[model samples]
Target: GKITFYEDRGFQGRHYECSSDHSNLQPYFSRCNSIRVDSGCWMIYEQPNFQGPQYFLRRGDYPDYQQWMGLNDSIRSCRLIPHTSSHRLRIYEREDYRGQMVEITEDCSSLHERFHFSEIHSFHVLEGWWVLYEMPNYRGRQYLLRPGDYRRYHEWGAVDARVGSLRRAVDFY
Candidate 1:
C-alpha cells in the first residue's frame, strides 16, 4: 500500500513516498501537488494529524491536485484503507440511532430517492466495510466506515449528518 506525493504537479519536484499511516506529514513536504497510489486504497487529509476534509484514493495516478478535487495543494496526513467483506450497515435519522432506521445489507446508490430521507445522523456497521456519500448517487464527499457503532456524524469524523448514498467497500484487488 505505497503512495507517493509530489510537491509539484505532473509528478515533478521533491517527493515523499509512504506505505503506512502518517499522522503528520509536514516534515516530509509542505504541500502535495500530485500523488500516485501505487497499491491499495488510501485516505488523505487536508489538515495535520488526520483532521479536516478527507479524500479517498485507490490505486492510480493523480498528475495534479485538481484530479483529487482538492481546493489547495495542501495534504497534511494520510492513511491506508483496509479492505473487509460481508457488508451490512444500519442508518438512523437521529443521533444515537434513535430515529427512523434502515438496515442495509447491500449498496444503496441513492438514499434520498430510496429512503425518503436526506440525512443520516447516526449509523452502525454490523459487518464488513462501507462508504457513505454526502450526495445522492455517490456524488459527493465520502466517508469510509468499518464495523462499528457511530452515535453521531462527528463520531465518524463527518462534517454533517447528510448521507445520500451508501456502498459496500468491495475488494479492489
Candidate 2:
C-alpha cells in the first residue's frame, strides 16, 4: 500500500510517503493533519507502536482529520492491510473460543441486530482481515483483525468486550 501524510492540511508541508507499516512515524513527520491513501487499505493509530485509538482508511484522500474520523492530528503509527480476495470470521460468545459461535462472511453494521449480542468474547479470523467497531454503523474505536485467533477482546487490543459492528478489510481499489 502507498500512503502520504502531510503535516499541514490539504496535502501541504512536510509530506511523507510510505508503502509499508511503520511502528513509529515521529521521525518522518511531526504531525498528520491530512492524508492520501493511494493504494490498499490502512489502519492509522494515534499513538506510536499501533496503540491508542485507530481508524481504518480505504484508498482515498483525507483533507483533514475529520475526513478519516480522527479524534485529532496525532497519528503516530500506521499499517498496510494485506490484500485478500475472500473473508471469513467467527465470533464467539465466550472466551477461549467457547459458547455459541456466529460465522460471518460479510459486513455487519450492527452485530447486536444480527446476533443479539452486545459483546464478542473471542474471534477467529479464518480468512481475511477484518475491523471490529466499538459502535454500530462502523463508528467508534477500531480494532484490526488479522488472520488468526483472538482468544479474548484484549487480544485484539480492545479495551472492553463491547463491539457493535464488523467490516471486512478489502484492499482492492
Candidate 3:
C-alpha cells in the first residue's frame, strides 16, 4: 500500500510518501491539503494515535481536503488497512454485546430506516474494515473500525453513540 500527502493543493508543497501505519505525522507536514492513494484503503485521522475525526480513502486522488469530506486541513495519523474479501459486522442495541443484535453484511446509508434502533451502544467488526459515519450519506464524523471487539462506543472513539450509517471498506477504488 502506498499513500502520499501534500501540504498544498494540487499535489504541491512538502510531500511525504507512506506505506504503513503512522501515529505521528506532525513532523512530516503541518497541514494536509491534498492526498493520493496509490493502493489499499486507509483511515486518516485528525489527531495523533488514531484519535479524532477520521475519513476512509481508497485508491484515488483527493485534490483537496473537501474531496475527502474533511471539515478541516489537519491530518495527524493514518493507517493502511489490509484487504478483506468478506464483510461481517454485528451491531448491538446495548453495550457489551447485549440487547437486540443484528448482523449487517451490506452497506446501509440510513441505519434508522433499516434498524430503527434508538441508540447504538456498541458494535463488533468480525470481518473487514468499516467506516462509521456519524450521519447519513457517509457524512459527519468518521470512525474506522478494523476486525476487533468494541465493548463500548468509546472504544471506537465515538461520543454520540448514534451510528447513522456504516460502509464496508474493501476495494473502494
Candidate 4:
C-alpha cells in the first residue's frame, strides 16, 4: 500500500502514504527487521513498495519553551546532498552521557533507547542536491545533519575548534 506524490520538478520532496502492510517487508540493510511507520505525522516512505524504514516529521508541535533557548536539543533537521556518494547525514550518541561516537546506519535497528538517540531524531539526506528537513526530538542532545565536510568534535566541545579540524575537501560516499 503506497501513495504517489508528485513533484513539479520531476521528483523533489515527494511524500508517500503509509499502509498497514508497510512493515511486512524485510529490511534491506538488515535481517529479521521490517520497517514500521510512526504515527501522528506523514512520512515519505523511502521504499516504493511502502515497506520501509520510513522517515517522518512531527507536525503541529511548536517549539517548546526549552527548545527556544538554543540549548543542546533535537530538532528535525534534514538536508539534500546533491552530488554526494554516501548518505550525507551522520548521527552520533554518547553512552551513559559519556561521549562516544558511532555511525548510525539507515535502519533504526538499535533497541536501547536510553543510550542511543530515538528513531524520532534520525533523518537522511540523500545524494544529488536534495532538501534537508530537521524534525527535532528532545533538548540537550546535540545532533547534526549537514552537507560537505564538517568539523568533528570530542566531548561536545567548542564549534570553532571543530571547524579547525575539518579538512577543506571531504570525500563523500
* TM-score (C-alpha, index-matched) for candidate 2: 0.91
**Where is model 4 poorest over a 10-residue stretch in terms of lDDT?**
161-170
lDDT of 1 by residue, 79-170 (tens): 78777657778888778988788998998988867885655688899998677888877667878787899998887777766778887766
Please name the candidate that would achieve the greatest TM-score relative to the true structure.
2
Candidate 4 lDDT at 89 equals: 38
**Would you estimate the TM-scores of all the predictions?**
0.84, 0.91, 0.88, 0.22
Q: Which candidate, 2 or 4, has the higher lDDT?
A: 2
Candidate 2 whole-model C-alpha lDDT, 0 to 1: 0.89
What ranking of all candidate models by TM-score puts the best one first?
2, 3, 1, 4
RMSD of 3: 2.1
**In model 1, what is the error at residue 36, expressed in angstroms?**
1.1
Q: Order the candidates by lDDT, highest first — what do you get? A: 2, 3, 1, 4
Write candidate 2's Cα lDDT for 23-87 as tens digits. 99999998889999999899999999988998999988999998988999999999998888799
Of 1 and 2, which scores higher on TM-score?
A: 2
Q: How well is each residue in 1-173 modelled by candidate 3, as lDDT tens digits?
A: 89999999999999999999999999999999999999888999999998888889989899999999998889999998878889999988899999888999999797766785766778889998898898898888888888999989889877777778899888754
What C-alpha lDDT, on a 0 to 100 scale, does residue 87 get in candidate 3? 90
Query: Model 4, 67-170: lDDT tens per residue?
Result: 12232222122211123344433443322323443443233222234334442222223222222222222222222333433223332222321111111112
Clashes of 4: 21
Clashes of 2: 0
Predictions in order: lDDT? 0.83, 0.89, 0.89, 0.27
Question: Which stretches of model 2 miss by more than 4 angstroms?
Answer: 116-119
